[PDB]
Amino acid sequence: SHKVYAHDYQAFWLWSGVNPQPALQQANQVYLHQGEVVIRQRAAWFQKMGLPSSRLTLPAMWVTVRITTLDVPDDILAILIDLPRRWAAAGNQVIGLQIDFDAGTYRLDDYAGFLRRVRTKLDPNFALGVTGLLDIQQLNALPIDELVIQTYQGRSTVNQYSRYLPALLQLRLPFKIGLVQHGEWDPQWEQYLAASPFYRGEVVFLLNHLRSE
Numbered sequence: 221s222h223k224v225y226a227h228d229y230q231a232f233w234l235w236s237g238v239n240p241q242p243a244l245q246q247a248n249q250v251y252l253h254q255g256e257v258v259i260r261q262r263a264a265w266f267q268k269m270g271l272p273s274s275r276l277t278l279p280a281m282w283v284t285v286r287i288t289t290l291d292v293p294d295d296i297l298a299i300l301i302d303l304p305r306r307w308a309a310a311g312n313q314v315i316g317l318q319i320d321f322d323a324g325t326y327r328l329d330d331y332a333g334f335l336r337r338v339r340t341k342l343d344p345n346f347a348l349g350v351t352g353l354l355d356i357q358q359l360n361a362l363p364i365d366e367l368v369i370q371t372y373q374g375r376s377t378v379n380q381y382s383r384y385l386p387a388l389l390q391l392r393l394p395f396k397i398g399l400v401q402h403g404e405w406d407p408q409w410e411q412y413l414a415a416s417p418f419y420r421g422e423v424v425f426l427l428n429h430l431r432s433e
Contacts, residue, residue: 221406224377224399224424231396231423233284236269238426247279251318251351251368251423254303256286257296264292266299273306280313282349286320290334294341301342316347316365328358335363351398354384360392367393368423372400375427385409389416400425 226232226243233251234240244250255269266285283303301317308314319338321331339348351368369388371381377400388395389412397413399405401424413419 221404224401224403224405226401226424226426229399229422229424231421233398233423233425234271235425238428241426243424243426244278249280249282249315249423250278251282251284252278252307253284253286256288257292257300258288259291264289264296266296273303273310275311278312280315281307282315282318283307284318284320284351286322287334288323290323290326290330292334294337297338297341300338301346304346305343314346316349317342318349318351318366318368321350321352328362332362339363354378354381356387356390356392362393364393366420367391367395368398369395370398370425371405372398372403372425375400375403375430377403377405382406382409385413388413388419391416391418394418394420396420397422398425399423401427 226241229243230247231249232243232247233253234244235253253270255267257264257266285300285303304314304317317338319335335348335350342348347365349366349368350362350364351370353370353373369384371377395418399422410422
């Protein structure tokens with residue numbers, strides 16, 4: 221029943237607006253936020269954010285994009301799938317594209333269709349990952365290479381996150397747990413989830429200091 225410290229972990233999200241941290245230099249993977257697809261005037265719009273595509277001293281990396289709507293045209297999906305392409309052209313080891321679903325009430329059919337579309341447009345050397353808030357004979361049907369279950373909102377672990385953990389042993393795809401830096405977390409859960417051959421460990425969302433510090 222302790223708090224999450226980066227020095228105990230090896231995979232991290234670096235979000236827009238978050239500064240790099242020494243823990244990055246011990247990491248095996250980084251999940252680099254690059255922007256969001258949002259509705260502006262009843263139409264989807266990509267907002268590029270975060271670090272510009274460039275050579276940086278990072279471990280193997282994902283490009284992460286948050287999707288707040290699944291009504292997204294092919295031209296924006298084309299921009300999304302070019303992001304890992306650009307990061308790879310800059311000299312980095314790029315694992316693939318991670319979709320961060322933050323869209324609301326959709327049916328799993330629609331998520332599946334959206335991911336099918338992305339994978340069709342994504343270069344086959346790139347993996348396709350999903351992450352989102354906690355929320356199976358059809359869920360393991362997701363056409364994805366990695367799932368990350370987030371346990372936080374903002375700077376805090378969600379209260380009663382543990383309610384969603386026991387059934388993750390039924391997942392049949394590589395999965396991880398997303399924890400916020402300095403949030404509440406019981407690491408006994410790690411041991412529990414280690415029972416599944418599909419468990420791949422944790423990812424820590426790094427945070428800056430609050431202004432009020």
